[PDB]
Amino acid sequence: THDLVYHSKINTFVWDVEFDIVLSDSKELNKCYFVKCFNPYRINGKCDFAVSSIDIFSEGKRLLIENEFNFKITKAVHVATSKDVTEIVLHLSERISSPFPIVKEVVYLD
Amino acid sequence: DYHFEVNGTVVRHKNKGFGYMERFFELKESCDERSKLSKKQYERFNALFNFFEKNGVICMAKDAGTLNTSIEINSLAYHGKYDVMKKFIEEQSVSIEDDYKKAFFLACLGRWEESYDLYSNIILNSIDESNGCVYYLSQINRYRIYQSITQAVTQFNGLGLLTFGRHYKPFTDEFLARIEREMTNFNIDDLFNGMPFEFQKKYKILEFLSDNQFLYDDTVKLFELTNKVSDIVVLLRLYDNLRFLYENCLWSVSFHEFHQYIRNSMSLLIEKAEYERTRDIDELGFSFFGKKSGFFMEYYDFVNISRHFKIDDIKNLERSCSIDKIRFGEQEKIEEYLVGIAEEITKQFSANGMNVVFYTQFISEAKAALYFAKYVKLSEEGLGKIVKALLFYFPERDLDIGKRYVWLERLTKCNELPKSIISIIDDFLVLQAEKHIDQNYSEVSSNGLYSRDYGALIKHFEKNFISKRLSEITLCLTQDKQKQIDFLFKLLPLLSTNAKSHLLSFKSVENINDLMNGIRIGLIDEFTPEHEELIIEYLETRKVNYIDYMSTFGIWYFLEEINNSKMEEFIGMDDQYDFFVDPENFDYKKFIPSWLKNYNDKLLGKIAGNKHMKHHVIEVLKERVKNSNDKRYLEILMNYFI
Amino acid sequence: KLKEVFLMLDNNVVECIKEITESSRNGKLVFFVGAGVSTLSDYPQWWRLVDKYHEELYGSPKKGNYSSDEYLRIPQIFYNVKGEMAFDGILKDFFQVDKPTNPIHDKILAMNPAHVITTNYDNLIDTACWKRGKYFSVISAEEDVANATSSRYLLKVHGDFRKGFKGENVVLKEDDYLNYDQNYPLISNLMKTIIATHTIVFIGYGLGDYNINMLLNWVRKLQKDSFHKPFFIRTDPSPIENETLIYYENKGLRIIDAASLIDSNEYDYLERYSAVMDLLIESQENKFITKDDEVIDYIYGKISPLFALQYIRKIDLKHVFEYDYHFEVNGTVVRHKNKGFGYMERFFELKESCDERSKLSKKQYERFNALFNFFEKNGVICMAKDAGTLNTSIEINSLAYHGKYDVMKKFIEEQSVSIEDDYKKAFFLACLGRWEESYDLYSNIILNSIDESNGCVYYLSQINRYRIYQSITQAVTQFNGLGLLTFGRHYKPFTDEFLARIEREMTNFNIDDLFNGMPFEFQKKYKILEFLSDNQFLYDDTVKLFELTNKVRSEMSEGSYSFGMSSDIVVLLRLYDNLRFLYENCLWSVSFHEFHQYIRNSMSLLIEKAEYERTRDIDELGFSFFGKKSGFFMEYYDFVNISRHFKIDDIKNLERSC
């Protein structure tokens, strides 16, 4: 739990951690992770408001299509270095009000 | 006995004997004193005059009226003249010093095996039948090349196999064994002591090279951050320490000790100059006395920044200080150097380019150069060649598609986009489309950006650019090439009207999930009534569930691109929805500041432009920033709400 | 396989091999190459030359075997009767065939000998010296001795054909063998002094050569303890039989034989030499397998000199062990380049096991106790992988840091006891500003510190007095200029006679040359004290401070709060490590301009980072409720550091940003 760093200008916790995924539809995904991209200088010509280009990797190579906003839950989540951190992830998932509270490697393209 | 100041002159100190230097400098100007000198010794005076004017010692301190030293480097390696060094290496060597610089150049092109062999040849042929300077230098360079080979082989064949798939073993195993055997227990500390006693008295100034750390000048660098309210004695020493190592063909210019203080001098100098500015403004005035920052980057400054800095270090430079206030001198020379880098990249990938050590040594400076290029006004042809190289011949193992797009957006900030650059980007998009015909090929990016941003940038710079090639590719589409249709969906604005008409029939809109898929890929621009009715049923479904995308619908309504009024009947639930649909009757006690951290420039501009929420939002932000040190809330407050 | 081959070695061989390696690493090993290394690959020997002398002289081939005297009598007879021309022609015909070098010569030169002495007239060793890239002044005739070009001597005792293939240039006949001291006095004296003052290892000789017997007879007239017994690398294909070994060991030859080491054939000279050479070389990179007795012995051999020193910082302990182990500042140790026995790991495990200590030697328990007391005071705890709750307390057990002027004044007024008390008194005197008396105290310490063989006190006193000379010169220059107008009275600090005296005795000092002029054992044991002469000792922790500054600022701009270890603990534990080293040992340059700025920069960074961490923008919980436990508790030492190494401008800038 020494690799978790909270970022301020975007409500996110960076942590090299993989979480199993359960969404509203029956399709289920194994341990995966998110990558957020804070870009306030992004081309938003259309009705785009988000400053974060948030996407998902399944196994570091499998980027799944966004499609609908799946109602994902953290389920069992592993740091892949020390031990399972399920509580340590779910406890700070709330009181954030930002989608994908815990991601890995925010790119911070300014 | 004499303090040779780096600014150009010399000052006296501890010369208990006669003042030979003062008399020499006095006779430098008087022609009669020159004439009265003896004939056999006159040529020696001429040689001394040539040496002293070359090294940059002008005059004494009592008459040092002119002291501006224009640094000049004539080394071929500094300017990255690879085409010249290759031709020189192909040319046979006539002497030993020419052989020495051939060895050094061979070391800078990554061919370390040939460089080591040629250094061994020099050692054999110049054992002691000279002044010994070449023998000493070629012993040190040999050891440094051996260290570099060991470090590369412990890393390239150690862990970096995935950087080229399978072990490329750039150095042969027999060669590795030979260099290990020939260099068992080579004492580098005592090497200078093994030289003849005459050498140790004459070339005493070459002692530091045989040391584990020799550049203990960093302790002097602590004078750059003293807050007493110059710095030119450090920059001149940096050039003084670069014209030695890079012009005497020495193999101590690629290690981490050299790169560490160059990354420390060039950072401390710019930071202190940034502190000289923004501090004189406090008591002198913004523009009445704020002429310039003080620092002036030149060709030999940009080259150092390119060669030694990394991307994270450059970003740290940009975050701390505003480099945009620092003008880049000698724009033409920077343009030519960048064009040379682009030519080298183009020639490297197009050819075999299997040689990997030089690739790794040179890709860093190439990336740093094309990163810093945004500060230099590049010529039209030069920019065209730069962009062509960066798009079609830069390896994808180092620069991903997202980083590639970031690089161009960085380059287009300080320069427009004439027809040539947009034509190059159009050709790149065409190449991507032709690559997408393979249904098993997918883009990999570590920045979130993709090929959509290229079309978006083209449209932003040119509102009516219709890529006829893309239109023809769309016309020639089939049903089974689903991935191609998706990719062309991502670039809808760049297609022609008949192309759009043919494409839209392939994939229509469905319910809300596909609706939002089309919105993300920009399928629809004006919200058609059918889309509007589809929206309501989702909200009507939400009411049943309540008795998500709701924030998106509220924001769209706030942006006035949704003109439906019956949705006004559906308020009193989510905070953001009511905020963006009915600011009149919102009770503001439920507002959360975190929302403001997800809004781009235009949304905050529209929020600030509205009267009914400006005061509430600004007082919320002030309350939040009073009790916290968050820079994001203050940044939002000052950029848009003042 | 070779690792256990080193084990199947007699204790005499075990100690001889380590002695040779120690001499080689000490630059004291002088090789003695003889006939047998040359004839290894293809070089012709003297027997065939004597055969052709018999042919040209006696008509018929030699019958039977010629005796030892005939080896020199037959060529002498040929020279006396037929003359010099035919002799020179025969030598020219024989000795012109160039032969390639052999790996044994490369192995010999790979041990970095201080000198090599050979009786070979060939240039095989000479060419191997040139081709490998190692310089040697060739001394073969008398005139070369006067014209020596360097300090390394490739001595050709019997001469060579470098000036021409002539009989005079080489000692081959009986006349020049008998009249050797009357023809080659200088080279003989040089050989004798090299053998006396260095370590000699004979290779190639076989106890049946005139040179070996002459040297052994020369040894008999060298008292008892005035000479070292040279080593002997015998490579005959027969066991030493253990009686001639006794005879030659009594006469002064510690024989090492290759027949016992390896089971080679009778025509395996190459393998016979190569076994011993590889065994010697492989022992130059590592020591033998260790036990509880030797590990503590090795550590005490590498740490005992540091005992005289009051305190030693942790970063340079890698130099003590020569980059074998990376000593982390937090008190942990990690493996960096120790490609051998893990002595530090075993030391720490034996530290953490009382039962493993009961099997120690008699007094080695006391040595380990001393090492434990030393390491406990130095803050090192355990290995890097095994470390937890490493909280440590910062303490300075000195008086200059605490600013107790009256206390150290009273201490100065008290009587002296030893050299250490005088040293600390001189440092206190310099701190009080009475530099005039401090210089005299340091001079007296220098004078009285050489009668006792310590070195540390003398070296540190010289450094301190040189820095005091710098300080008083700076004070004088300030006073006679700006200081003359800052205050009314000029206030002449020191007498003109004293200034003239210090100027006379300070000229041509060459401070950086002080360590080079130090005795070899002093610079070997105190490798870390070289950094005190120059400003290298701040480079190690300045390069890693300018890099943590950018790292912390990057997080400042990025706004990434961390919930784990703070990056400002490496600098914090380096502040009170360099400060403790500089103050506890009572060195000067605690008021050095460069050292003050490093402290100021580190303090400024610490306060910036701590004030940033104080106002966290966290509205959520930490690990469970909160991660941080405390902040920047400005201790007494922190206040002293801020008060002593800051100016008004620096504190003002710090206030206007925190």
Numbering used by the authors:
A (entry chain C): 11 to 120
B (entry chain B): 337 to 565, 580 to 897, 911 to 1005
C (entry chain A): 14 to 671
Publication excerpt:
Here, we collected high-quality cryo-EM data to generate a three-dimensional map of the DSR2-DSAD1 complex with a nominal resolution of 3.49 Å, providing detailed information on the complex architecture and functional insights. The structure shows that DSAD1 binds directly to the CTD of DSR2 at the site typically used for Tube binding and activation of DSR2. Our results demonstrate that DSAD1 competes with Tube for the binding site of DSR2, resulting in the inhibition of DSR2 activation by Tube. Each X-shaped DSR2 dimer interacts with one DSAD1 protein. Furthermore, the DSR2-DSAD1 tetramer in the inhibited state shows a structure similar to the “loose” conformation observed in the inactive apo DSR2 tetramer. In contrast, binding of the inhibitor DSAD1 to DSR2 induced minor conformational changes in DSR2.
Defense-associated sirtuin 2 (DSR2) systems are widely distributed across prokaryotic genomes, providing robust protection against phage infection. DSR2 recognizes phage tail tube proteins and induces abortive infection by depleting intracellular NAD+, a process that is counteracted by another phage-encoded protein, DSR Anti Defense 1 (DSAD1). Each DSR2 protomer consists of a conserved N-terminal Sirtuin (SIR2) domain, a C-terminal domain (CTD) and a middle domain (MD). DSR2 assembles into an elongated tetramer, with four NADase catalytic modules clustered in the center and the regulatory-sensing modules distributed at four distal corners.
